[PDB]
Ligand binder design. Structure first.
Ligand SMILES: Cc1cn(-c2ccc(C(N)=O)c(NC3CCC(=O)CC3)c2)c2c1C(=O)CC(C)(C)C2
Length: 207
């Protein structure tokens, strides 16, 4: 397992998300589903010129998996996935400019719900999760596990868990007071409110 320091701007973003009083936490789900949808559009687009890009799996879908025993909510997709370079460097570079723009908009009167417009909606996971684990597999790289409980650092390791074929799993280790997001009625309500027209089948798993 390798340990990395978040860039100052992303650490500041995560602290703002964790510390700011903001009751409309439910928007985290649409942000993660939007990232999944963008990932699925990318693999679908690439497959039109190279059909062998779907040898790692033809199905293009999103699964929402609650686990009350583990207190986790997992957002699974069969999108493009992320490489080691994406996890450590590429996406952090993109997140730096988005974070600066989001911070300025917030000072000017914007709301935390607008985070996704700045391309840093992933970090809205910290509205409800004490720890986030990202398991991912891109066609050109190995399966990786990224993880962070904030506090300025994240880890990356090659993942030895169940092989995924292709895609991303975002595992939200929910805060003790955010267990409503494990309830079927609550997830169904949020999906219908904010994610009803996503162009991929969203399956809400139950227990
Ligand atoms: C910004 C940003 C977006 N995302 C993200 C999440 C999930 C997915 C997903 N569910 O795939 C995703 N997909 C992108 C990958 C790059 C691309 O080309 C567009 C889609 C991006 C993440 C970040 C981070 O700074 C931390 C991170 C690399 C662990 C995860």
């Amino acid at each position: 397992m390798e340990t990395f320091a978040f860039q100052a701007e992303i650490a500041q973003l995560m602290s703002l998300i964790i510390n700011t009083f903001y009751s409309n936490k439910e928007i985290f789900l649409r942000e993660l589903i939007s990232n999944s949808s963008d990932a699925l559009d990318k693999i679908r687009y690439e497959s039109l010129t190279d059909p062998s890009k779907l040898d790692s799996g033809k199905e293009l879908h999103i699964n929402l998996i609650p686990n009350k025993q583990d207190r986790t909510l997992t957002i699974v997709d069969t999108g493009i996935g992320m490489t080691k370079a994406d996890l450590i460097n590429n996406l952090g570079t993109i997140a730096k400019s988005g974070t600066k723009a989001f911070m300025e908009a917030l000072q000017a009167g914007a709301d935390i719900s607008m985070i996704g417009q700045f391309g840093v909606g992933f970090y809205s996971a910290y509205l409800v999760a004490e720890k986030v684990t990202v398991i991912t597999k891109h066609n050109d790289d190995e399966q990786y596990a990224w993880e962070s409980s904030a506090g300025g650092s994240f880890t990356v390791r090659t993942d030895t868990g169940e092989p995924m074929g292709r895609g991303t799993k975002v595992i939200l280790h929910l805060k003790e007071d955010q267990t409503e997001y494990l309830e079927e009625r609550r997830i169904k309500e949020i999906v219908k409110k904010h994610s009803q027209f996503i162009g991929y089948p969203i399956t809400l798993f139950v227990e």
